[PDB]
Design an enzyme around this catalytic site. Structure first.
Site, short mmCIF file in Angstrom:
data_model
loop_
_atom_site.label_atom_id
_atom_site.label_comp_id
_atom_site.label_asym_id
_atom_site.label_seq_id
_atom_site.Cartn_x
_atom_site.Cartn_y
_atom_site.Cartn_z
N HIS A 9 8.35 -16.26 -32.81
CA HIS A 9 8.20 -16.29 -34.29
C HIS A 9 9.18 -17.35 -34.79
CE1 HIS A 9 7.58 -15.30 -38.41
NE2 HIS A 9 8.96 -15.32 -39.19
N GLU A 10 9.85 -17.72 -34.87
CA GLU A 10 10.55 -18.32 -35.86
C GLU A 10 10.91 -19.70 -35.27
OE1 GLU A 10 13.84 -15.05 -36.68
N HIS A 43 7.00 -26.18 -36.41
CA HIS A 43 5.22 -26.49 -36.83
C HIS A 43 6.17 -27.19 -38.38
CE1 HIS A 43 2.85 -25.47 -40.79
NE2 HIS A 43 1.86 -26.00 -40.23
N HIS A 51 7.47 -20.88 -36.77
CA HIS A 51 7.61 -22.14 -38.02
C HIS A 51 8.76 -22.87 -37.66
CE1 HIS A 51 10.83 -19.85 -39.55
NE2 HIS A 51 11.18 -20.92 -39.70
#
Lengths: 521, 506
Positions: free
Chosen positions: B314-315, B321, B318
């Site tokens: 998850h981390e 991104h 981002h």
């Protein structure tokens, strides 16, 4: 059917409202069109105000009742819708020149019925905005008033207070209905327990109330600012043509005479014989009922009222005399009506003090008077001082947190009551339970009115040359948008200190007489 | 950002204010004057917004603390003062024609940094009012969100919740920060006691909350009307150019597929082995690192260079991104990716069953639960707009029926749940929660395109992660959120995965 009669009225007001479009932009077409517009908006606006006021009342009586909540909400939407739809009216009146307006009055005598209404508007030129702005303000009215509603609902419907041990040793549920009784109990433990129980809850929710009251205060300041008033107070008082000086005079004279309250509190401490006097000791009887067709004594006391006026237990006697006063004032037509009542009570008090010989009787009426004076001048003025303090502080940008409000209120309370009354920590939170702070500079009128009543009874009781005639003419006047000129005509100038100073002098002399009486017995 | 830094900024911002009037009325004098005005109002507005947001946060974290009540008060005052002093700006820009404005941009390249922002103002011509009106609206800003402030203090500082016995003889004080783990307790007595304790309080204060929330809703509706929007929903969604059709679609397709949630509840009831399943049973678990470096193997060459596990992806989602709704697409997409990799790789069936359930659980919260809130939120604005009073009785009855519709037959109708509407902070946002479910679904359709190795899938994704128009951005990435398809094949993925769980349990 309360909401079915409502349904019919909503529908009728909503449809009539469509005719607003037809009047808008016609004011400059002629005196006739001007008259028709005034007739239209006053008629629609007042019919909506009536429904609003009614639904609000019903809400306040049982705020936890779904049907009332619903009725009040529907009536608020209607009110804002109507207010908004009719908001072009004063701006458009004001696009005419003062002399065009009174030129219409020459042409159409029928307008004379509204002159006083058109006069206010003309005199308020500086505080009426454009149609665009008035439209925003009217339409947002529900938002501005919302936090008063949140207060009402939280205070009256959702809060529940703890249980205490009652007078007969039985479990008692605290509540708004029962609290006042409990604060009067001769059983001190019950008093202390009711007081601490109730305040434990206001303390818990002090942040919520600061938020609701803070928002209310912010709205007054914002409206004052955008309407070009110099302050929230000037804004509220102006629409009744009350100069700010009546408010300053009240607060200043009361502050200068706090030692009289201080003294009255020493006396109460002595009478109760308690080691320390607390807030929860101030509402219990210190003397406890004197040994006494109250009609005869009523008509006899009121004699100083004179021929015209006449033809037109001990506590209930005061009530009777209080009601006759409102009854005679009603015959000719709220603060203005309260004067006719209080004046009568004043006249009965004096009459009793000039005829009663029994020390217990005299003591009872002396203290009954000082007590009413404590609640109506000192306490209401305390509130008036705090109300103003909150507005001025917020306007300067100082956050009204519960901590700041409470420390401030605690200090003001101690200033008022003096060293004879212990600084109870609980009383720092009292600001949060007072409904009147969600009005708009309303409470000070209790104290100015009481003082006025006092000045009026004193002029009558001494047959001051034109005292009676002027009081009667004040009765013949009737409710007015000009309470201070009405009062001025009756001989009481509320811009000056003297009329409050006279009341104070009376408080002191009767206080002094009560003490001497207590010493003899 | 610290409190001390806040005071420093607060002080400076107070000072810069005196220079706002100095730019008013100069916008038509040329490109320089325009640039100077925009540099100034955007600096002062934004920086004041930054410290307001901070103060707002410290206040929501410690609402009973005088230090933060005061901080937030002095930030709200400043922010409304700044907003009002600068309220002339948009109406004046709009007194120019679009072509006069863009001409400035050709004449003065230092304006290019502001193009996107001016675009937004230029696109919003129908919804920006006059100087007088904007000044009044901005000055009343604090009055309009007062009830949100009142909610937070009541909810965070004043409400006292009951005490309960935890899974020892341990007396636990109920609070927001601790409720969740009580609901996850394997001890059923603790769960129910926490549940009823909590709702006993919201039931008592249902009238007060109805009044703060209804006031909040009214503000939305009022603002929407004066700005010439057809509804509060359109007004809020237009800021990110999101057509209302993405909201209707979300709600319709979710409603159409509620039988899937019912089944899932049916299964939960069996796994818990309780004769009656209640709301307070819904959160306790039903079952019992270069993997990440591998999981992203079908992410392409460019990309590269059990719970703990997911959070690292998850981390890392981002994180890549960066080489909000949008960033959460890229993070949830990565989770979709290992859910598939575990599913394809793991041999032992108890592990297989866990990730199955992990997926469906995340689904149940992020799409079904958040959409339920999104539906109720729209329902409240809609009713209030038609003039139906939002009394607590009506709110609670309506919330009750909506909760039963969603959870279906397997779940008892707990009377406490009728009052849930009153404890949800997101209802004081502005049409916010629906983005959870759309974002989740969009992340699901992208993962499928990637894992299934479709024509240009990879490319598009790593062209997406290479704004203010999320709908078109997503459409360019091949998922069209105006249509039902993308949510429908997320539901198929939920249905297939359920089928596998049950079929595994046997």
């Amino acid at each position: 059917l309360s909401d079915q009669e409502f349904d019919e009225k909503y529908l009728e007001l909503s449809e009539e409202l469509k005719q607003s479009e037809k009047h808008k932009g016609t004011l400059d077409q002629g005196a006739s069109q001007f008259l028709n517009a005034i007739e239209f908006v006053l008629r629609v606006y007042r019919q909506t105000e009536v429904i609003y006021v009614y639904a609000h009342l019903k809400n306040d009586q049982d705020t936890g009742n779904t049907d009332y909540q619903a009725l009040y909400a529907r009536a608020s939407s209607l009110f804002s819708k109507v207010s908004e739809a009719v908001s072009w009216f004063e701006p458009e009146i004001l696009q005419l020149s003062d002399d065009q307006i009174w030129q219409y009055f020459k042409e159409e005598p029928k307008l004379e019925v509204y002159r006083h209404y058109i006069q206010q508007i003309v005199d308020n030129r500086a505080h009426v905005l454009s149609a665009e702005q008035e439209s925003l303000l009217a339409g947002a009215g529900e938002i501005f008033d919302a936090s008063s509603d949140t207060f009402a609902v939280l205070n009256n419907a959702d809060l529940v207070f703890p249980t205490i041990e009652g007078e007969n040793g039985e479990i008692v549920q605290l509540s708004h209905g029962v609290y006042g009784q409990l604060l009067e109990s001769t059983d001190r433990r019950v008093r202390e327990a009711a007081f601490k129980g109730l305040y434990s809850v206001y303390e818990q929710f002090r942040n919520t109330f600061a938020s609701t009251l803070g928002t209310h205060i912010k709205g007054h300041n914002f409206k004052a600012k955008v309407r070009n008033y110099s302050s929230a107070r000037e804004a509220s008082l102006s629409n009744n043509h009350i100069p700010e000086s009546v408010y300053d005079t009240l607060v200043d004279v009361v502050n200068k005479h706090l030692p009289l309250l201080h003294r009255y509190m020493e006396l109460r401490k002595r009478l109760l014989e308690v080691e320390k006097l607390h807030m929860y000791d101030l509402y219990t009887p210190v003397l406890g009922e004197a040994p006494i067709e109250a009609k005869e004594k009523a008509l006899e006391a009121l004699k100083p009222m004179g021929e015209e006026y006449m033809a037109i237990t001990l506590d209930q006697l005061f009530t009777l005399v209080h009601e006759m006063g409102h009854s005679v004032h009603s015959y000719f037509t709220i603060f203005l009506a309260e004067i006719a009542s209080t004046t009568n009570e004043n006249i009965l008090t004096e009459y009793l003090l000039e005829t009663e010989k029994d020390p217990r009787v005299r003591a009872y009426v002396l203290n009954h008077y000082l007590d009413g004076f404590k609640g109506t001048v000192f306490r209401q003025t305390q509130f008036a001082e705090f109300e103003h303090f909150m507005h001025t502080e917020d306007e300067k940008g100082v956050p009204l947190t519960s901590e700041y409000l409470s420390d401030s209120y605690g200090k003001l309370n101690a200033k008022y009551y003096g060293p004879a009354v212990e600084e109870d920590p609980e009383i720092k939170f009292e600001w949060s339970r007072i409904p009147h702070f969600y009005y708009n500079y309303y409470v000070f009128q209790y104290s100015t009115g009481f003082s006025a009543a006092s000045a009026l009874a004193k002029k009558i009781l001494n047959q001051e040359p034109e005292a009676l005639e002027n009081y009667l003419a004040y009765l013949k006047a009737g409710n007015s948008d000009y309470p201070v000129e009405v009062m001025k005509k009756a001989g009481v100038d509320m811009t000056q200190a003297a009329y409050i100073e006279d009341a104070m002098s009376m408080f002191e002399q009767r206080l002094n007489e009560l003490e001497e009486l207590i010493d003899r017995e």
